[PDB]
C-alpha cells in the first residue's frame, strides 16, 4: 500500500553516467587541493596551534 | 591587550576548583541497573526501596555510602544498542517472575519463563558486559507455591525435565515450604545458574535469591552482595584468592 506508492516515485528519476560524476569529483579535488592545510603542511610561522 | 588573558586565567581556576569537589561525590557512589521482562515486578521492588531512603531513577542512602538505582527506561522489546553505555556499573539487578511458567506473553510465543531465559542468555554472553556481575531476584514466590500446592497444571507439561529432577542434597528447605514446593523452586534456580556457570571465565558471578517484591527486606541483601562484589574484585586484582 504505502511501500508500493513510494517506490514508484523513486523509480522514475534522471540519472547520469558514473564517468561524469567521477570527473566532476576529481576536478573539484584538483582545483581545491591548493588551499588544504592538512594536505600541504602550513609553515610553522603561520600555525596557530604551534 | 594582556589584561584580557589575566581574567581568562582566573575563570579556569574557579571552574577547576569546582571539579575537584565533584571528584569526591562521583568516585564515592555506586550505580545499579534494573532489567527484566515485562510484568516482572521491577517497579514494585523499587517502590519498596524508595520509602526506605523517559528514564526512572532513585537515590537512597544505607549507612554512609551512596547508592544510585535507575531503570532501563521502560522501552519496548528491541535489540539493545544502549546496553553499551552501562559498562561500568557496580552490578546488574535481574528480576524474573518464576510463578509464570504456564503463561504466554505474540500468543504463539514460548512460555514467559523461556523468554526470560532467552533474554538472560543474551545479556550474560555480551561483549560489553564481560566484567559485570548479576544479582538474580526469583520474584513472586507466593504465587508459585499456591500453583504447586493445588493439583493442576504440573511443571512436567511445559518442562519435561521435572520428572528426572530431584532435590539437591545441599538445599536447605524453608520451614513453611513443603517438599513439593522446595523441589519446584530449586529446579528453576538451577536452570538459571546452568547458563551462568557454563560460560563464566571468573570475571563475574551470579547471586540467586528467593524474594517477594512486597514484603521482603531486600535492602540488606543488595548491600551485602555489593560488598562481596567489590571485595572479590580487589582480591582478583591483587592476584590472590
Amino acid at each position: 500500500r504505502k511501500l508500493v506508492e513510494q517506490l514508484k516515485m523513486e523509480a522514475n528519476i534522471d540519472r547520469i553516467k558514473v564517468s561524469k560524476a567521477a570527473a566532476d569529483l576529481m576536478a573539484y579535488c584538483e582545483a581545491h587541493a591548493k588551499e588544504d592545510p592538512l594536505l600541504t603542511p602550513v609553515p610553522a610561522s603561520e600555525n596557530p596551534f604551534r | 591587550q594582556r589584561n584580557e588573558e589575566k581574567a581568562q586565567r582566573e575563570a579556569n581556576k574557579k571552574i577547576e576548583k569546582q571539579l575537584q569537589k565533584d571528584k569526591q561525590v562521583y568516585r564515592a557512589t555506586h550505580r545499579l541497573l534494573l532489567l527484566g521482562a515485562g510484568e516482572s515486578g521491577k517497579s514494585t521492588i523499587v517502590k519498596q526501596m524508595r520509602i526506605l531512603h523517559g528514564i526512572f531513577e532513585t537515590k537512597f542512602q544505607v549507612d554512609k555510602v551512596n547508592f544510585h538505582m535507575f531503570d532501563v527506561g521502560g522501552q519496548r522489546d528491541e535489540r539493545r544498542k544502549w546496553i553499551q553505555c552501562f559498562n561500568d556499573v557496580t552490578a546488574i539487578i535481574f528480576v524474573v517472575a518464576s510463578s509464570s511458567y504456564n503463561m504466554v506473553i505474540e500468543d504463539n510465543q514460548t512460555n514467559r519463563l523461556q523468554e526470560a531465559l532467552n533474554l538472560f542468555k543474551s545479556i550474560w554472553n555480551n561483549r560489553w558486559l564481560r566484567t559485570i556481575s548479576v544479582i538474580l531476584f526469583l520474584n513472586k514466590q507466593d504465587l508459585l507455591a499456591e500453583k504447586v500446592l493445588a493439583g493442576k497444571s504440573k511443571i512436567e507439561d511445559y518442562f519435561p525435565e521435572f520428572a528426572r529432577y530431584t532435590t539437591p542434597e545441599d538445599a536447605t528447605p524453608e520451614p513453611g515450604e513443603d517438599p513439593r514446593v522446595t523441589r519446584a523452586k530449586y529446579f528453576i534456580r538451577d536452570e538459571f545458574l546452568r547458563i551462568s556457570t557454563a560460560s563464566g571465565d571468573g570475571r563475574h558471578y551470579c547471586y540467586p535469591h528467593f524474594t517477594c517484591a512486597v514484603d521482603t527486606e531486600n535492602i540488606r541483601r543488595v548491600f551485602n552482595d555489593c560488598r562481596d562484589i567489590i571485595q572479590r574484585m580487589h582480591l582478583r586484582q591483587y592476584e590472590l584468592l
Binding site: - | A28, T197, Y205, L240, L241
Partner: protein, 283 residues
C-alpha cells in the same frame, strides 16, 4: 685471581640494580594511566633502591677489592649514613604497602575516602623523615662510639674503614628499622589470608556443584623472599654486639650484602601487572 672473578659478580649486582629500577621509574611517570595512589609507594621504593644501588654498593665493592680506603675520615661517615638511610627507608615502605592492601581488602567502601593523594604524600614524607632522623643525626652527633683501642686507632687512621657501635645504638636502630614493621606485616597478611579463605569458602558454597594454592604462593613469594634474606643479618647484628667475639667479621659482611641483593629481587616481586608487562615490552 679471586678479585678478577668476584669483580664481575659484584659488578652484575651493581648493573642489575641500577638497570632494574630504571624501567619502573620511567614507566610510571611517562604513562598517565599508571599513576595511581598505590603506585606512589612503588615509585618511592624504586627511588630508594636506585639511590642505594648507585651510591652504597660501588664504594663497598671498591673497598673490598682495593683492601684500603682512600677518601678519608669524612666520606667514610657520609657513606655509612647514606647506607643506613637507604636501608631504613626501603623496609618501611613495605609496611605501608601491606597496610594499604589491608585497608583496601578489609574495608572496601571506606577505602576510597580514606586514602587520597595528599594523605599518601604526607605518609611518604613522614616515612622518609623518620628514616633520615635515625641515619644522619646519630652518626654526626657521634653517639655510636666504641670504647677500645682498636676503634680509637681506626678513627685515628685516615685510610681504614670499619663499623664499631655500642649496644644501645645498635639495639635502637634494629628495633626502629626491622622488628617493628615485621610484626605489622605478619598480622596484616594473616588477616588478608583469612579474608581470602572466607571469600573462597563462600564461592564454593554458592556454586560448588557445577564448577587456595594461589593465595599461598602469592603470600609466600612476598613473605619468604624478604624474611629469609633479611632476618639473619639483623639477628647476627643484635647477637654479635651483646657478645664478645662469638662470630667473625667475614660472616657479617656476607650477611650484609644479601640486603643489597634484595633490591634486585624487589622489582620482580612487585610490578607484575599486565600493564607493567605491556609497558616493558613496548619500551
Amino acid at each position: 685471581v679471586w678479585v678478577v672473578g668476584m669483580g664481575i659478580v659484584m659488578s652484575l649486582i651493581v648493573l642489575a640494580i641500577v638497570f632494574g629500577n630504571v624501567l619502573v621509574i620511567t614507566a610510571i611517570a611517562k604513562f598517565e594511566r599508571l599513576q595511581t595512589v598505590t603506585n606512589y609507594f612503588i615509585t618511592s621504593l624504586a627511588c630508594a633502591d636506585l639511590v642505594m644501588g648507585l651510591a652504597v654498593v660501588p664504594f663497598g665493592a671498591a673497598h673490598i677489592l682495593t683492601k684500603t680506603w682512600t677518601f678519608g675520615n669524612f666520606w667514610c661517615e657520609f657513606w655509612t649514613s647514606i647506607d643506613v638511610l637507604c636501608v631504613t627507608a626501603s623496609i618501611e615502605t613495605l609496611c605501608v604497602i601491606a597496610v594499604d592492601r589491608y585497608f583496601a581488602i578489609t574495608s572496601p567502601f571506606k577505602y576510597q575516602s580514606l586514602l587520597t593523594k595528599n594523605k599518601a604524600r604526607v605518609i611518604i614524607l613522614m616515612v622518609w623523615i623518620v628514616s633520615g632522623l635515625t641515619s644522619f643525626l646519630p652518626i654526626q652527633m657521634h653517639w655510636y662510639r666504641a670504647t677500645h683501642q682498636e676503634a680509637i686507632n681506626c678513627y685515628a687512621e685516615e685510610t681504614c674503614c670499619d663499623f664499631f657501635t655500642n649496644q644501645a645504638y645498635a639495639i635502637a636502630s634494629s628495633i626502629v628499622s626491622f622488628y617493628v614493621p615485621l610484626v605489622i606485616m605478619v598480622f596484616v597478611y594473616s588477616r588478608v589470608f583469612q579474608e581470602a579463605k572466607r571469600q573462597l569458602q563462600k564461592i564454593d558454597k554458592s556454586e560448588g556443584r557445577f564448577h587456595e594454592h594461589k593465595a599461598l604462593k602469592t603470600l609466600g613469594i612476598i613473605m619468604g623472599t624478604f624474611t629469609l634474606c633479611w632476618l639473619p643479618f639483623f639477628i647476627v647484628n643484635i647477637v654479635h654486639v651483646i657478645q664478645d667475639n662469638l662470630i667473625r667479621k667475614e660472616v657479617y659482611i656476607l650477611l650484609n650484602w644479601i640486603g643489597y641483593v634484595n633490591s634486585g629481587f624487589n622489582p620482580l616481586i612487585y610490578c607484575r601487572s599486565p600493564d607493567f608487562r605491556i609497558a616493558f615490552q613496548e619500551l
